[PDB]
Design an enzyme around this catalytic site. Structure first.
Site, short mmCIF file in Angstrom:
data_model
loop_
_atom_site.label_atom_id
_atom_site.label_comp_id
_atom_site.label_asym_id
_atom_site.label_seq_id
_atom_site.Cartn_x
_atom_site.Cartn_y
_atom_site.Cartn_z
N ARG A 39 0.98 -1.17 0.13
CA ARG A 39 -0.09 -0.09 0.01
C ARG A 39 0.97 1.12 0.11
NH1 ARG A 39 -4.20 2.47 4.65
NH2 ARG A 39 -5.21 3.71 3.15
N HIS A 43 0.74 4.41 -2.46
CA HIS A 43 0.49 5.86 -1.95
C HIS A 43 1.65 6.64 -2.50
CE1 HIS A 43 -2.82 5.32 1.47
NE2 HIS A 43 -3.30 5.26 0.27
N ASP A 44 2.86 5.91 -2.53
CA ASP A 44 3.95 6.81 -3.00
C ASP A 44 3.87 7.11 -4.54
OD1 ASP A 44 6.88 7.68 -3.20
OD2 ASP A 44 7.32 5.81 -3.87
N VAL A 47 1.60 10.11 -5.71
CA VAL A 47 1.84 11.45 -5.40
C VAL A 47 3.36 11.54 -5.89
CG1 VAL A 47 2.12 13.09 -3.67
CG2 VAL A 47 0.41 11.16 -3.18
N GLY A 49 4.82 10.79 -8.16
CA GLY A 49 5.77 9.82 -8.73
C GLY A 49 6.37 8.80 -7.59
N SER A 53 8.80 9.51 -1.50
CA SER A 53 8.67 10.91 -0.64
C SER A 53 7.58 10.94 0.58
CB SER A 53 7.99 12.07 -1.59
OG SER A 53 6.61 11.64 -2.01
N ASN A 71 -3.03 8.56 4.81
CA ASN A 71 -1.96 8.01 5.80
C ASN A 71 -2.16 8.20 7.10
OD1 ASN A 71 -0.39 7.34 3.38
ND2 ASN A 71 0.24 9.85 3.20
N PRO A 140 -7.38 8.43 -4.09
CA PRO A 140 -8.85 8.19 -4.32
C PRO A 140 -9.24 7.82 -2.67
CG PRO A 140 -8.01 6.30 -5.00
CD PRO A 140 -6.81 7.33 -4.93
N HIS A 170 -6.62 -5.62 -2.57
CA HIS A 170 -7.46 -5.86 -1.52
C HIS A 170 -7.79 -7.38 -0.95
CE1 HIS A 170 -9.21 -1.43 -1.66
NE2 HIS A 170 -7.80 -1.61 -1.40
N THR A 171 -7.34 -8.19 -1.63
CA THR A 171 -7.31 -9.77 -1.38
C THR A 171 -6.96 -9.98 -0.21
OG1 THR A 171 -7.42 -12.01 -2.51
CG2 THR A 171 -5.40 -10.52 -2.49
N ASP A 230 -4.91 -13.99 -3.38
CA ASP A 230 -5.62 -14.73 -4.50
C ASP A 230 -6.68 -14.07 -5.18
OD1 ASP A 230 -7.22 -14.76 -2.14
OD2 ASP A 230 -7.14 -16.76 -1.62
C1 HEM Z 1 -9.01 2.11 -6.12
C2 HEM Z 1 -8.85 3.08 -4.92
C3 HEM Z 1 -8.62 2.33 -3.64
C4 HEM Z 1 -9.17 2.52 -2.44
C5 HEM Z 1 -10.43 3.76 -2.39
C6 HEM Z 1 -8.34 2.27 -1.51
C7 HEM Z 1 -8.74 2.45 -0.06
C8 HEM Z 1 -8.29 1.93 0.84
C9 HEM Z 1 -8.67 1.93 2.46
C10 HEM Z 1 -9.54 2.93 2.88
C11 HEM Z 1 -7.89 0.93 3.12
C12 HEM Z 1 -8.01 0.95 4.63
C13 HEM Z 1 -7.07 1.81 5.25
C14 HEM Z 1 -7.32 2.05 6.72
O1 HEM Z 1 -8.65 1.49 7.27
O2 HEM Z 1 -6.59 2.40 7.53
C15 HEM Z 1 -6.96 0.36 2.18
C16 HEM Z 1 -6.12 -0.88 2.42
C17 HEM Z 1 -5.33 -1.38 1.62
N1 HEM Z 1 -5.13 -0.87 0.18
FE1 HEM Z 1 -6.16 0.18 -0.87
N2 HEM Z 1 -7.46 1.52 -1.77
C18 HEM Z 1 -7.62 1.47 -3.17
C19 HEM Z 1 -6.49 0.93 -4.17
C20 HEM Z 1 -5.78 0.08 -3.70
C21 HEM Z 1 -4.40 -0.23 -4.44
C22 HEM Z 1 -4.14 0.20 -6.02
C23 HEM Z 1 -3.41 -0.86 -3.95
C24 HEM Z 1 -2.32 -1.39 -4.34
C25 HEM Z 1 -1.74 -1.95 -5.30
C26 HEM Z 1 -3.98 -0.96 -2.42
C27 HEM Z 1 -3.60 -1.54 -1.48
C28 HEM Z 1 -4.16 -1.74 -0.04
C29 HEM Z 1 -3.64 -2.74 0.83
C30 HEM Z 1 -2.97 -4.19 0.60
C31 HEM Z 1 -4.63 -2.45 1.60
C32 HEM Z 1 -4.23 -3.07 3.23
C33 HEM Z 1 -3.23 -2.37 4.07
C34 HEM Z 1 -2.92 -2.74 5.32
O3 HEM Z 1 -3.80 -3.89 5.87
O4 HEM Z 1 -2.28 -2.30 6.32
N3 HEM Z 1 -5.31 -0.32 -2.30
N4 HEM Z 1 -7.36 0.83 0.93
CA LIG Z 2 5.24 9.87 -3.73
CA LIG Z 3 -7.25 -13.49 -0.07
#
Ligand code: HEM
Ligand SMILES: [Ca+2]
Ligand SMILES: [Ca+2]
Length: 306
Positions: A39, A43-44, A47, A49, A53, A71, A140, A170-171, A230
């Site tokens: 993640r 996030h890097d 923003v 690129g 940062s 963050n 987003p 998000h798997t 998965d």
């Molecule tokens: C398309 C828009 C996306 C939205 C709206 C979004 C939103 C979020 C939110 C709100 C969380 C929970 C954070 C929290 O509750 O503290 C999260 C977790 C996560 N997101 Fe996304 N996400 C998106 C795309 C992505 C992408 C593109 C990746 C990586 C390639 C990603 C990887 C992760 C991972 C692996 C987690 C779990 C992190 C953890 O458990 O510490 N997300 N995301």
């Molecule tokens: Ca950055």
């Molecule tokens: Ca899974």
């Protein structure tokens, strides 16, 4: 100056190994760390690129990104990033950049979690400044429309295919109550819960996240296999078990092209992995600092000389 996979080949031959090794150890005391690191890379890159940062800390002049809405009380694993950086610093002094570190860590994390592997493109240099404001407007939000979300992805250089595929990250991983409880009781001021959210699940979440309880209680993004990488994330969407509003929107927004992509990934895991691996290189290729731009931090938390 173009990124390439053998950039550290002659200076840090075993870099891929060191990174993998370190994470696999951190995974001994934190199954969640795998999803946390990827993640950060996400996030890097969204923003300024992929310039690492997001790793810089607050100083008199640097306004740390670690405080932007996305963050704050959410981003984690920075201590592990340092452990990775240290290992690399002993084996290969002043060689590997923190930008590449996050790119390498993302692959290793997905890999160890049972997911795909891919040739990681290296050669990114570390930024000299952070962008708090940009973090607030470029990343987003889970409650944004599929339309609004698509847009922000276009803004950095990723398309609908890249969107659905990268959303599969998000798997595994966690998400707090505060980022989805809006769907649990009174969704968009209608008096009722989000109808696209499965009835069985809804109840479990209304208890996990009471209206007056803590907004920081966490749960798994994937109730199916919380830590395995998965294609279940997409199977879940089909049953209306998507946790985040942004998740379900990928499948329950009638008349959207994202629906076929989702049903495709939930139907064949090879396809999802291929697409994902692909969309991961793509995101890694966003606005990178190369050549005489940026630097190679010895410590990821601050610029050199500081
Ligand atoms: C398309 C828009 C996306 C939205 C709206 C979004 C939103 C979020 C939110 C709100 C969380 C929970 C954070 C929290 O509750 O503290 C999260 C977790 C996560 N997101 Fe996304 N996400 C998106 C795309 C992505 C992408 C593109 C990746 C990586 C390639 C990603 C990887 C992760 C991972 C692996 C987690 C779990 C992190 C953890 O458990 O510490 N997300 N995301
Ligand atoms: Ca950055
Ligand atoms: Ca899974």
């Amino acid at each position: 100056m173009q990124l390439n996979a053998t950039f550290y080949s002659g200076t840090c031959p075993n870099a891929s190994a060191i990174v993998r090794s370190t994470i696999q150890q951190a995974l001994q005391s934190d199954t969640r760390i795998g999803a946390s690191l990827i993640r950060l890379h996400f996030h890097d890159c969204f923003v300024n690129g992929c310039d690492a940062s997001i790793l810089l800390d607050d100083t008199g002049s640097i306004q740390s990104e670690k405080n932007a809405g996305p963050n704050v009380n959410s981003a984690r694993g920075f201590n592990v990033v340092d452990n990775i950086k240290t290992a690399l610093e002993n084996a290969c002094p002043g060689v590997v950049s923190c930008s590449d570190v996050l790119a390498l860590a993302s692959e290793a994390s997905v890999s160890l979690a049972g997911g795909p592997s891919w040739t990681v493109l290296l050669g990114r240099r570390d930024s000299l400044t952070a962008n708090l404001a940009g973090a607030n407007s470029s990343i987003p939000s889970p409650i944004e429309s599929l339309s609004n979300i698509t847009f922000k992805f276009s803004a950095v250089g990723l398309n609908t295919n890249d969107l659905v595929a990268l959303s599969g990250a998000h798997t595994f991983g966690r998400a707090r109550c505060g980022v989805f409880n809006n769907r649990l009781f009174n969704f968009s001021g209608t008096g009722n819960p989000d109808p696209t959210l499965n009835s069985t699940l809804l109840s479990t979440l209304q208890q996990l996240c009471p209206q007056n309880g803590s907004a920081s209680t966490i749960t798994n993004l994937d109730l199916s296999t919380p830590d395995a990488f998965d294609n279940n994330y997409f199977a879940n969407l089909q049953s209306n078990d998507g946790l985040l509003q942004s998740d379900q929107e990928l499948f329950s927004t009638t008349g959207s092209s994202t629906i076929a992509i989702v049903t495709s990934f939930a139907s064949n895991q090879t396809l999802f992995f291929q697409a994902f691996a692909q969309s991961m290189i793509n995101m890694g290729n966003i606005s990178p600092l190369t050549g005489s731009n940026g630097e190679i931090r010895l410590d990821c938390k601050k610029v050199n000389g500081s």
